[PDB]
Every structure is written in C-alpha cells, then in structure tokens.
Amino acid sequence: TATLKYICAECSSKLSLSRTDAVRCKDCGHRILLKARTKRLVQFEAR
C-alpha cells in the first residue's frame, strides 16, 4: 500500500511531508508539487 500526498511536476512521484520538511521534491529541485486526487470516490451524471 503506502498512501501518497503530493507529487512532482516533472519527476512526478508520490511524495508528502509537512511543515518545514522543505518544499522541493526528493530529487528534482523543481519546487512545484500537486496534491493528487482524494481516496474519496467522486461521482457524476452521464448527461
């Protein structure tokens, strides 16, 4: 398993952390990072 959290723009790879744990990625200095979908299941109307 192993739950993710954030992700790298380029070297896209589950990451995560928290306050003061820096901001960069565990590799690409590229200090961006997305938050990735919710485990929670979204739903939609087929129209």
- Interface positions with another protein (CB under 8 A): 6-7, 9-10, 12, 18, 23-24, 31-38, 40-47
Token reading at 16: 């995560």
Rounded to a whole number of angstroms, the minimum distance from the CB of residue 40 to Zn ion is 25
The binding site for Zn ion (CB under 5 A) comprises 8, 11, 25, 27-28
> 8: annotated binding-site residue?
yes
Spatial separation of the C-alpha atoms in residues 14 and 43, rounded to whole Å: 24
Which one-letter DSSP state was computed for residue 19? T
Spatial separation of the C-alpha atoms in residues 38 and 26, rounded to whole Å: 22
> 17: annotated binding-site residue?
no
Query: Which residues are annotated as part of the binding site for Zn(2+)?
Result: 8, 11, 25, 28
